[model samples]
Target: FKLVFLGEQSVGKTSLITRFMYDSFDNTYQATIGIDFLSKTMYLEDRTVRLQLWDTAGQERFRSLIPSYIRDSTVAVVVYDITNLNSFQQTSKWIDDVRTERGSDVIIMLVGNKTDLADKRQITIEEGEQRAKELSVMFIETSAKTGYNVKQLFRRVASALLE
Candidate 1:
């Protein structure tokens, strides 16, 4: 299974993936120039799924290069910093771009990350969930720093792919 993570710059995509796969979190924030790929194997009901997780650079400058990676993706996770309103707002365009380049059936999840910083949150959970509903995608808020909902998020996407 191929999963792609997309979001605005500094939205914690790397930290989230790293935390999930390594069970560790990094405090330093580094910009991904192109993409970072991580792989993990999971045993499903009757099959083993090798997940090829793709983390894309979130800068608008990298938007031109996104289509190539977006293609053939089984799932696209559109992440946003809970404290960044613009990041949350851009989820729509990302979803549309993925759908345009991939397919309508591509499973997309609107992820509101950085839930650990709830005190700094600029986007409410209700608003995010509503937007996900309007866009026809699943929604969840997560905190990679605390390892909250990370596994569940991946599991939901993997299960969706199987279905």
Candidate 2:
């Protein structure tokens, strides 16, 4: 299965993926220039699935380059920092852009990451959940720093795709 990670820059896209796949997290902030790909094999109850994860650049300039990565993507994880309202606000636009190009049945998840910084959170879970309901996408809050809800996020995404 192919899955793409996207959102505004510095929304913790890279950190979330890294923590999930490598069990490691970095504190430095470096913008993803193009795309980073990682592969992992997951043993589901019925079958073994190979996940090809694509972490895309979050800059507006890279928006034009996203379609190429979106092609054949079975699932998309749209991440936004909980403390950044603009990133959360752009969630719909990003999802719309993907849906316009991908299959109608494509699985999409709205992920509010960096939940470890709850004290600084500007976007509440209620708001994110409401938006997810409006978009018909599953919602989750994750903290890669503490490995909080990271597995659940991916598991939900995988389950949604299987369903």
Candidate 3:
């Protein structure tokens, strides 16, 4: 299955995949310019799927890829930094954009990253879950740097494909 991460700049959109690839390349997302196209085959208990990741810089030039990317994606992991309140709030637009393109045709996960900095948390896990509930998407908090919930997140991704 193919997927990509979405969120404001510097919100860990790229690193989330790095964590996933680290635990799962269990290897990399971001800037510039074009898709950081990478793929890996993951073996699960019941099956195996080729996970392809597309990383793009949130620049308008790169925004050109959203339609096709979102349209083709199996999952849209909308990530936000837990300690960054603005990042959390901007997710609404991202959600709306996905809805506009896929319209219930995709599994959108609301991801809260940087859980290791809970002390600086501006967005609570409950808040993440609540917003996810309101938006009708799945939710999870993770720490790409520390590897917290990184593998678990892919498990969730794997389950999405199975279902």
Candidate lDDT scores, in order, read 0.89, 0.87, 0.79
Q: Which segments of candidate 3 are over 4 A away from where they belong? A: 23-32, 59-61
State the lDDT at 163 in candidate 1: 92
lDDT tens string, model 3, 52-135?
887755545656667777878888888889998988888997888888988898888899998988789999888999999988
Candidate 3, position 58, lDDT: 56
lDDT by residue for model 1 (27-59), tens: 987878644688999866688888999999889
Model 1: lowest-lDDT 10 consecutive positions: 29-38
lDDT of 2 by residue, 1-163 (tens): 7889989999998888899899999899878965478999876658877888899888877788788788679998999999998999888888987888886768888999998897999999999999999888889999999999998888888877777
How far in Å is the alpha carbon of 50 misplaced in model 1? 1.2
Best by lDDT: 1
Per-candidate RMSD vs. true structure? 1.3, 1.3, 2.9
lDDT, candidate 3, residue 51? 87
Model 3 worst lDDT window (10 residues): 24-33
When 1 and 3 are scored with lDDT, the better candidate is 1
